[PDB]
Ligand binder design. Structure first.
Ligand SMILES: Cc1cc(N2CC[C@@](CO)(C3CC3)C2=O)cc(C(=O)NCc2cc(F)cc(-c3cnn(C)c3)c2)n1
Ligand SMILES: Cc1cc(N2CC[C@@](CO)(C3CC3)C2=O)cc(C(=O)NCc2cc(F)cc(-c3cnn(C)c3)c2)n1
Ligand SMILES: O=C(C[C@H]1NCCC[C@@H]1O)Cn1cnc2ccccc2c1=O
Ligand SMILES: O=C(C[C@H]1NCCC[C@@H]1O)Cn1cnc2ccccc2c1=O
Ligand SMILES: [Ca+2]
Lengths: 466, 471
């Protein structure tokens, strides 16, 4: 079981939660972690969802080799690099494959692993040296088609997070300082970790435009015979989502997994003690499983002989199975069963004939409530502000600030440095742009930038970050 | 596609997989770009096999790709220790196995992963089939008994057989491997074997190992049984690769190009409207789109090729090289009569079908295609194996691009010296104007007479073993 409290030692809470749920296992080489099945299941679930969705958009999956903060092979010619990202590997193929408008749009995606070999200290799931992800890359005849694909993908990532992991996130555009180098515009979804006040980027959807197109000479001819440059997008998202899910829904007893990505939604734990009604208990469990699976609920019966009922309670609690269904001899005479829901503890006595509808209802209810609570904590962690004097208070309450900004990059860099210096004084760490939210709250006519006094351009979300 | 399969096989293969837009070539030779037309097949069998092993209790994971010294090696970020990239994951996993297994309560442990591996040999690569980087899955289990582990490897091998026969329509022989060719460090290796008739070679489709306890002993993977005695776990491993893809292509290709079994084809039915460039009015494409939704209701993977700059015949050739099994032609005369012309890629036969009749007939065809593609291949299999009885007969059968089913003593020095002699003899013929190893020892052992002798020593022959040249 898990000792530490989420809200006072967050770090050791997090690692107890991911280790004692058999999600992670540690490894020789720092910043690599073994992803055990209990996590891999969730990843498979979100993978299936995103893959179905992007296949509906006409994206096709592919595999490009891993050879081309970078890592280099030495011996067994030339040095070979391991892909940090595969722009450099894919785009020459793109330049060869595209020659006329009749070959656009071209939309490829790949699920693979990448290596980003930073020497700072890792955080499992969140900042690792090898992570699993997807990366998609499209080229279009026009910029407007490309942009709408950027936004369609960003909406998928919203769903990936909100709809599947019940994690609330913010759509926005990245500042010039923090956008992708040599992209034209970088959109993003951003999450919030309330326990340390930090923001974290959840996924990216870049509008590359034509910069790569000309570096790599990816060109096509329209219906006139004139060769134009293609407009490109790339986008991707990683196992970091799992981490953000954990930190969003964990409590002092361990994980809490939203039903939509839980591989076991209902665990049926039989109470056996002193050989009382063992055969009937086990029969009823198997019948309840049959019935619940007929309603497409994912059921496991923990009928393992070598474990105590109370051990099973705590085992599936810490693993975060959303619904536990206890069945013993009393309930055999009653035709009901006790169901405990992992997110609140509440118990219910449900009739067997009512299990399937009722359990479905409970599961929808759990998912929604995980999301709504989470969404609440997010919008209560966002302090809108007018002046820079209001920044450090909010930072110390572990919140983000939403302020008017003039949007020039020197603004951001000196804000970064100044807030890190102030942090170091108070300790005797920096605050950066998180994003420029799509949903722009009202901007009065005369409003001035919260740092420079210059005329404001847009509302911008700032805070400490990963 | 210009080259002719029966004549220049290697140039045939290269053209077939390049002009079908399966592979694209790359700087680093040994590593290829797998484009959608092929990766979809990989996705289809990946899903099949993954569903099947999940229902057996196997669960997926991901281990890292880096194993450290305590094979290709990576040095500079200046490194403290050269780290390698996994060629296989036994050494990355089995320490974790040692840590996670303590009691019989923890058994069985069944894991699996879908990853890429890197085996960096300096001999020349052949795409899909022998690459320096390839996608695979590798599964690793551990059991309390020996019989449990055995049962699981035979079950996995059955799954491999389906993967080849049921999905790719590629027939394969379930066999056991010589102790000379068996996994070093394994106790008994089982395999499925395939046969390329154009170069007469055998090839290892997938393998399923009975590792026994040797790895358990090396890594200290022990459990206490119910009586409290510390015991070694019995382990299995097993793997399959994108080589399946290669085997499939070769198995079914003809002079026009690929032929992809309907069960794994990304496009099962391609709809080619007959618009001879020019104006292109809405009347034709309209019907095609309706037909598409009509067909997708019945779960058919459909594509309309409406690219304006090409002639119907060009498209015909394009999709024939890509190997799509059914081609649906919709022209103005077809529109007038309310029908469509379907022609199967395998035999070239054409059918005129009403639109009502379109969904069932197509499905009845695809089955027909699937089945036929298999059984033809199966015969080309049985016609490649000659049941000889003395060593005198082997060179006439291997120069016939065959494999032979000879009775054998099962003595490993026999194997190594038959390899030596078949190369030598092989070389003299080459000079006048290659080695033959054992492929497997089959499970369907035919009748064995009392005191039949072996085909190379004269000793009492143990079992019928299948030999040929190979990859
Ligand atoms: C799992 C993952 C995801 C993403 N990102 C970035 C992109 C994005 C955004 O959503 C997604 C693709 C679109 C995502 O997931 C970035 C990293 C990462 O930079 N890893 C290297 C590393 C290793 C290490 F041990 C420590 C640190 C480190 C950095 N600062 N400090 C204080 C420590 C970094 N890793
Ligand atoms: C795709 C793939 C699959 C398998 N294996 C083996 C096992 C099996 C069988 O089912 C499956 C996993 C269990 C399978 O598919 C083995 C290789 C491979 O050894 N690659 C290295 C390489 C690169 C190269 F350029 C040349 C050569 C080479 C070797 N001899 N010559 C004349 C050239 C070898 N490659
Ligand atoms: O990876 C990206 C941008 C997009 N490229 C692939 C599609 C999704 C992805 O967000 C940003 N980035 C991040 N880190 C690096 C480290 C070394 C080399 C290149 C990079 C590098 O390019
Ligand atoms: O990979 C295997 C046996 C099984 N191990 C993983 C599951 C499926 C697979 O057949 C055999 N082999 C083959 N080639 C190597 C090259 C370098 C290092 C180790 C190996 C090595 O071990
Ligand atoms: Ca849109």
């Amino acid at each position: 079981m898990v000792t530490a409290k989420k809200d006072e030692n967050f770090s050791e809470w997090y690692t107890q939660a991911i280790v004692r749920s058999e999600m992670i296992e540690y490894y020789d080489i720092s910043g690599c972690y073994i992803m055990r099945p209990w996590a891999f299941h969730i990843w498979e679930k979100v993978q299936r969802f995103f893959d179905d969705e992007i296949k509906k958009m006409g994206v096709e999956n592919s595999y490009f080799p891993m050879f081309v903060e970078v890592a280099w092979v030495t011996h067994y010619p030339e040095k070979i690099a391991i892909r940090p990202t595969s722009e450099t590997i894919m785009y020459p193929a793109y330049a060869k494959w595209i020659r006329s408008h009749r070959d656009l749009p071209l939309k490829l995606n790949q699920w693979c692993s990448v290596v980003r070999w930073e020497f700072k200290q890792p955080t499992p799931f969140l900042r690792t040296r090898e992570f699993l992800w997807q990366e998609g890359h499209t080229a279009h005849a026009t910029e407007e088609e490309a942009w709408e694909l950027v936004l369609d993908i960003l909406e998928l990532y919203r769903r990936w997070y909100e709809e599947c992991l019940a994690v609330p996130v913010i759509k926005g555009e990245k500042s010039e300082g923090e956008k992708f180098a040599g992209g034209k515009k970088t959109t993003t979804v951003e999450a919030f970790i309330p326990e340390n006040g930090r923001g974290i980027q959840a996924a990216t959807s870049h509008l590359l435009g034509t910069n790569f197109a000309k570096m790599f000479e990816i060109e096509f001819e329209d219906e006139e015979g004139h060769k134009r440059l293609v407009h490109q997008t790339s986008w991707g998202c990683t196992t970091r989502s799992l981490g953000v899910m954990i930190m969003t829904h964990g409590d002092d007893k361990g994980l809490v997994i939203p039903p939509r990505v839980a591989s076991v939604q209902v665990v049926i734990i039989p109470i056996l003690f002193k050989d009382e009604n063992t055969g009937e208990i086990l029969g009823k469990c198997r019948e309840l499983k049959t019935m619940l699976e007929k309603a497409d609920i994912r059921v496991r019966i923990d009928d393992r002989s070598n474990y105590t009922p109370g051990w099973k309670y705590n085992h599936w609690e810490v693993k975060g199975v959303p619904l536990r269904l206890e069945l013993g001899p009393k309930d055999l005479a009653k035709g009901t069963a006790r169901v405990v829901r992992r997110d609140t503890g509440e118990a219910y006595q449900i009739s067997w004939a009512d299990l399937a509808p009722k359990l479905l209802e409970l599961m929808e209810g759990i998912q929604r409530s995980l999301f709504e609570k989470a969404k609440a904590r997010l919008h209560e962690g966002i302090e809108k502000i007018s002046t820079f004097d209001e920044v450090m208070p909010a930072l110390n309450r572990k919140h983000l600030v939403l302020a008017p900004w003039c949007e020039d990059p020197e603004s951001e860099e000196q804000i970064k440095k100044e807030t890190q210096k102030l942090s170091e004084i108070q300790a005797i760490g920096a605050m950066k742009t998180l994003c420029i939210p799509f949903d722009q709250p009202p901007m009065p006519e005369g409003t001035k930038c919260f740092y420079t006094g210059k005329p404001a351009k847009r509302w911008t979300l700032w805070g400490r970050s990963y």
